[PDB]
Each structure stands twice: as C-alpha cells, then as structure tokens.
Design a protein around this ligand. Structure first.
Ligand SMILES: [Mg+2]
Length: 368
C-alpha cells in the first residue's frame, strides 16, 4: 500500500506539576505527532517526545527532520518496514526519536493491514499483567516523601524515585520516603547519569538497606565501561537506560557484563524494529527488561505497551507521564485502571489516535 502523504504536528501539552530529574526540569511535554496516509485511505499514527539532554533532539528539530523523512517515504510501500527504516537512515544519521514516530506509524499501518492489534502482529500475547510505577520528581526530601505518600494513597504499588544529587541528600531522600510510605511498597530509583563512579558505589551501598528494586543509569553514559565495576561492588541491581539505546549498545553492554537489566524505549531504538533486537538479546542473556519512555502521551505509550507483550523477559513497566498531563488528547489507546494496571487495545493496528479537532488546532505541516 503506497504512502501518499504524511502530516506532522507540534503537540505541546502542559504538565500539572513540573517534572524534575537530575538532568533538569520540564513544564511541558513537547511532542511531535506523525500521521501517514495511504492511497487506500488508511492512516497510521506515531508520536515521539524529544528530550534534549538525552536524545539531542527537540520538538523544533524533530518537526524539521521529520519533513526530510516524510519526503523520502512518499511513494513507498508502508509494509516494507525494514526497507523504509533503512531509507530514513540513509537520509539522516541518528535522530532516533523522530524516526521512531515514523516507525511506529508504519507498524500501525502494517498491523491494520493484517487485521491484528499491534501486540499480536508482533507475535505477542496477553499472558501477563502490565503494571506501571509512578515517578517522584527529584526535589527537597520532605516534598519527595509527601509525593510518595500521595502516590501510595492513589493506589500505585510501585514507586520510581529520581535520585542523582549528592550522596548525603539522595540517602536522606530514600530514607524519608521509606519511613514515610512503608517497606512493603516496591520502589526503584533512577539517577539519570547523576553520580560519579565513586559517588555511585558509595550511595548504592548506603541505600541497600532500604531494599530497592533496581537503579537506572547511575553514571554518565560516557562511562559505561565503569558499569561492570559498579555492578559487582553493589547489591542493588543496575539498569542501563541512556547507556542502552540500540541493539549494538545492548550487545556491547552484555559483552562486558555492564548491568543486570535494560530500560527499553522506542525513541532510543528508533522504533519497534530495532527494539525487537534489543529484546532478543536480553532474552538470550536472561536479562529482565523494563519498558519505559519520555513524555509521550498515551498514544506513544500505547505503542510501548504493545511491544511490552512481546516477550516474557519484559517484566517492569514505566508508563506514568501521560497521567501528568493537564489534558488527555488521545482517543482510544491503553487505559489506566486501579493499582496502575494497564489494559492494551485489542482492535486492529496501534489502537489509538487523537481526539477530533485536537489535531486541527495544532501547528502542522503536510508533506506531499
Ligand atoms: Mg532512566
């Protein structure tokens, strides 16, 4: 089925509370939306959420590069996913974030064509419960404990805590939380490259008593070679996030035994196609995978959720940010139930789209 036009949209939605990590503070989710049209009149949706300090892309750059990409895709068969992913790579290096949106949309169309929901089109099955955590922003420790409480009250059974400050402060943070919210509630932490190799090892051993599930990206992605040293000198398991973007990164990390688990994100792998490779590797190496994201709406996370059902090695889920939006512009897609349990669409394709004339109010361009 030939691709006849693609539309790109700037989708900036404000967050209720500012979102805070060791790398910076965000007030908005500044996403880019992608709609691919076929001659047969099918429409595929993709979304991406550029994060400047990690992707090295922005809503502004994504909106431009996306046009380069659309141009090259016009006239091609939306079913040749691999061919088209290569085509995009030939147009521009990197820019995985925006590429992922195109990729996701292509799979949407592919699943639609097959008359299956994405998860089934990928060979997955609904044989496990998807339960999301919820994220406490890095802040003054009292604030952080307060939030942790509210979160527990709202019924979430898994908390993800943003650390990455001084060793002293991060420990005060986890303690105040643990003593203000309980020892039964499972909690995981994320440094976003915040610590030095030194500070990491010291803080991670000082934190072990508080029973934490795993720690995401404790040090600079540039120092991934120091990960194996940290993995061995620290009980708590460490999960590679920024350090694991594509399948090559994954293989390299496995090779030097850098970490215990991965955090898989479709933006980092430039779409579903390569995410599948990372998953395979994680399987062969008996490594648990957490699927997560950035500030995608429920449309983006619906794609993540479909992919989450592809392999039993995936068993942790971080799909919370859409709940932080002032307003939900998505039509269909994953639904959040109590306890943070996620339910995946069963209709053909992605199983999500955007609310009527939400799109029409957006700054947009259209590639013929
Ligand atoms: Mg992370």
């Amino acid at each position: 089925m030939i691709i006849t036009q693609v539309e790109l949209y700037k989708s900036p939605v404000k967050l209720k509370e500012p979102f805070k990590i060791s790398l910076g503070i965000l007030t908005h989710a500044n996403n880019v939306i992608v709609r691919i049209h076929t001659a047969s009149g099918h429409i595929g949706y993709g979304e991406c959420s550029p994060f400047m300090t990690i992707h090295g892309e922005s809503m502004d750059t994504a909106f431009i590069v996306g046009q380069y990409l659309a141009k090259g895709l016009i006239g091609t068969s939306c079913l040749d996913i691999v061919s088209n992913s290569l085509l995009m790579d030939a147009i521009i290096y990197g820019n995985s974030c925006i590429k992922s949106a195109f990729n996701i949309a292509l799979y949407d169309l592919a699943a639609q064509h097959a008359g299956l929901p994405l998860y089934a089109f990928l060979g997955g099955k609904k044989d496990k419960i998807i339960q999301t955590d919820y994220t406490v922003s890095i802040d003054e420790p009292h604030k952080m404990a307060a939030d942790a409480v509210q979160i527990k009250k709202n019924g979430f059974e898994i908390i993800k805590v943003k650390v990455g400050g001084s060793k002293e402060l991060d420990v005060e943070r986890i303690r105040m939380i643990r003593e203000a919210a309980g020892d039964s509630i499972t909690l995981r932490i994320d440094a976003n490259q915040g610590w030095s190799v030194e500070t990491a090892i010291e803080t991670l051993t000082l934190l072990e008593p508080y029973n934490i599930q795993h720690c995401e990206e404790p040090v600079s992605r540039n120092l991934y070679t120091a990960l194996p040293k940290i993995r061995q000198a620290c009980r708590i398991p460490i999960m590679a996030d920024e350090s694991c973007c594509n399948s090559f990164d994954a293989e390299r990390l496995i090779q030097i035994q850098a970490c215990d688990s991965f955090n898989l994100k479709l933006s980092k792998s430039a779409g579903i196609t390569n995410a599948l490779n990372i998953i395979r590797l994680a399987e062969q190496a008996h490594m648990p995978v957490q699927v997560g994201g950035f500030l995608e709406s429920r449309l983006g996370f619906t794609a993540a959720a479909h992919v989450a059902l592809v392999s039993k090695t995936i068993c942790y889920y971080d799909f919370d940010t859409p709940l932080m939006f002032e307003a939900d512009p998505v039509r269909g897609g994953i639904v959040y139930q109590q306890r943070g349990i996620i339910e995946v669409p069963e209709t053909a394709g992605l199983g999500a789209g955007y609310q009527k004339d939400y799109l029409s109010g957006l700054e947009k361009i259209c590639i013929n």
